[PDB]
């Protein structure tokens, strides 16, 4: 009769946690219930409640909710709740039970391709939506369900995107019944891209217009309306997102990698998993963080040139974070052409991986660092894939039937044509074996 | 008391570190039959006297209890070690007791997501305790990963034993095809795909084709191509794919384990299997009838077959009572479903997509097999076989990724003679801000008296 959501409201909270300008002096601070969005800002946990339990207790309490289907713990993210949203009431949360991703030992690739042992790759694309935003929106959505509630007028979500940030949103919104709403320009509209926010039964709109006028009427309709937007509380998603770290670091019976390497789409990426690795050294958990890599996508931003440049020129789409973030690690930025991102994937997919093409840039820098003697071939290295491979088939069938313009594909795998006679097929398999 | 851990060491090596007399065993045996014959692991059998089936020394087995199983399990879970990392091989005793650790073949599968269906088991089923196990959020977005490890280790293990093994081969372009190349290639183990040209599609092998598959288009048909591939195999040492299928039995049962092991050890009410293979139902059958005949568990949960409409004589015979039924291959099926007082249903064409699109509706993106799972959860409600209570856990075999073109083509309005009643197509608006209020007004269907 009774479902997990009651079986654990059968059982003062001294953990809080608050917007704060990031990164700065003694200061200001605003309330999760708020809608602030400014510069950035962070979510500021009470570190002081925090550290009243040491870091045998922190573990201990993570370990024991390993591999549970209570309710919320059952969740990668919300196992860590005191650390994520404290306040929240557990029947606001929103969880699909994200997060408890795959961290796989890529042992072929590691040792074949790069002369390393103890190469693994964090899989946080291999989830419900295919993407690693769905970490962020179990938090954002959550958030959202809670002031709704508070009767706080949120009559639902908005969204003028048409990628993984959206798929995620609109997943976690039709969950909790909140409605959904995509603000788009007609020329931008594809159905392909598109797919899960409309299997999802978010409100798709197709306007007459571009991005411009688009961005103009979401201003107009969400200053009438009770309508937050994705990348508005965006600080929110990081809360969910720093736990894939604290994960690498739990799966691992709380080893600290030597190096992790993030594919810097994003730029948030980077600092959530900074985040993670942070909270967990300062609390005890461990007694350091790992030296990390923003792999980037060459000419992405300004940001591989600024690592160059021994971060001198830079001045406070943002790399802020991503910039405190590698000072705080001594950590390195590393690029990847479009043709070596590609040619790593094949090379990656051949040893029986499926990976995406950040995945690949993030094996590029990996191969660069290697060479550079900057990373030794016995270090733990934690490579983390963003979205799940089968997000980018058409790509991939691309590369293998050497079709995509300006690049050689090297290490295509096409079908091989042969005629229906035992004597030429087994003549190809002698060959190939 | 030992010595510092190598860091050249990786968890393989790491795990070397054991040598007394192993008292676990398994070999082939007859399916379902009485006193006789017997075949080993390293054979390769592959029928009898006419399936195989792999048993396991129950006696060796049931010299530890219950509690020693669920502990020993139990303490597997969440470590990175090798290769207890895998939700099959955390399992190792039950599935390949004698494998050596060194020639497993794994990517750490397994360890899916069981996810609590809330809203849709309560908006759509008047249900409290709906789970879908996701056997779909895996590396190759399929259930067979648990089966390909097992094959794929035991070949590899062979390959070893300089029993000639040159590679494996392949005649399918789904699912299976995808899982085993991605574990040959893990295994630097040749893998071959044998297909009529007219039946290669790119996007189909996109898998095994990144995976460094050695994939044949050739200029023949189906028949053909099983008449070479007979020739091939005769000439050369190449295992066939749905050949060793006995063996996958052994991985994919550990998914029902699994989901016990995530219930803290409690027995659900029901399981609803998707059956296009029709291995998928015994695999879990044998799964859970495992635990509770080793004291884990004390029962085991009743289940149904969710067929697609005139998929097999299956449906029809369960109609039947079995009464007509004489032992493609519904033999393991059907034992399974006797043994565990089970039921079959079917959902049309039709409903499984509406299904599909009603549960992703509520924040799911599954595949069709879990349309057809939950058409038959509707049904055997309605029918009042199945309570508003029942812990009812529906298995998803493969990730909703994989049918984006299907989801698409529904929610234009683009399946040829279907109502695609519950399509959700984007909606045209003109850029002008009355106009814009007036469709969200509606949407979000503020009105007191239409409301």
Same mark, same amino acid.
Not at 65 to 85: A, D, I
Not at 227 to 239: F, H, M, T, V
Not at 257 to 265: A, C, E, H, L
Not at 387 to 402: P, R, V, W
């Given at each position: 009769?009774?479902?997990?959501? =009651? ?10 946690? !608050? ?9 200001? &601070?605003?309330? +999760? ?36 289907? &209570? ?63 769905? $970490? ?6 959550? /958030?959202?369900?809670? $002031? ?19 798929? #995620? ?23 392909? /891209? ?27 309709? &969400? ?18 997102? !720093? ?11 709380? /080893?600290?990698? =030597? ?27 461990? =007694? ?11 000419? #992405? ?57 950040? &995945? ?11 060479? /550079? ?58 060959? +190939?074996?």
């Amino acid at each position: 009769p009774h479902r997990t959501e =009651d079986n654990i409201r059968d059982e003062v909270n001294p953990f809080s946690a !608050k917007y704060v300008p990031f990164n700065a002096a003694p200061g200001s &601070t605003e309330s +999760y219930s708020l809608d602030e969005i400014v510069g950035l800002l962070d979510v500021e946990h009470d570190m002081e409640a925090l550290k009243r339990f040491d870091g045998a207790y922190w573990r201990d309490l993570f370990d024991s909710r390993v591999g549970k289907s &209570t309710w919320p713990y059952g969740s990668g993210v919300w196992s860590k709740k005191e650390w994520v949203l404290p306040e929240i009431d557990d029947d606001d949360i929103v969880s699909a039970f994200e997060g408890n991703s795959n961290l796989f030992w890529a042992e072929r690739f590691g040792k074949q391709f790069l002369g390393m042992n103890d190469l693994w790759v964090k899989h946080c694309g291999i989830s419900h939506t295919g993407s690693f935003k769905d $970490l962020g929106m179990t938090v954002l959505v959550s /958030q959202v369900n809670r $002031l709704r509630k508070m009767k706080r007028p949120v009559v639902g979500v908005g969204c003028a995107s048409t990628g993984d940030t959206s798929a #995620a949103l609109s997943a976690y919104c039709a969950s909790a019944g909140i409605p959904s709403i995509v603000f788009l320009p007609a020329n931008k509209i594809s159905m392909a /891209q598109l797919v899960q926010p409309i299997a999802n039964g978010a409100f798709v709109l197709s306007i007459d217009t571009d991005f411009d006028g688009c961005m103009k009427l979401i201003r107009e309709i &969400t200053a009438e309306l009770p309508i937050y937007l994705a990348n508005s509380l965006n600080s929110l998603r990081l809360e969910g997102q !720093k736990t894939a770290a604290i994960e690498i670091l739990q799966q691992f019976d709380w /080893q600290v990698p =030597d190096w992790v390497i993030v594919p810097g789409g994003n730029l948030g990426n980077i600092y959530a998993f900074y985040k993670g690795f942070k909270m967990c050294q300062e609390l005890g958990l461990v =007694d350091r963080i790992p030296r990390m890599v923003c792999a980037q996508a060459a000419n #992405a931003n300004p940001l591989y040139l600024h690592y160059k440049s021994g971060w001198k020129d830079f001045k406070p789409v943002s790399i802020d974070r991503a910039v405190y973030a590698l000072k705080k690690c001594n950590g390195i930025v590393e690029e990847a052409t479009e043709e070596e991102l590609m040619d790593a994937m094949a090379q990656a997919d051949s040893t029986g991986m499926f990976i995406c093409p950040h &995945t690949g840039v993030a094996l590029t820098a990996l191969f660069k660092l290697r060479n /550079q003697g900057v990373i030794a071939p016995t270090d733990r290295t934690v490579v983390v894939s963003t979205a799940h491979g089968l997000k980018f088939t058409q790509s991939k069938i691309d590369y293998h039937s050497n079709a995509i313009p300006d690049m050689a594909c090297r290490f295509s795998n096409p079908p091989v044509d042969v005629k229906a006679d035992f004597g030429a097929v087994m003549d190809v398999l002698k060959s +190939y074996l």
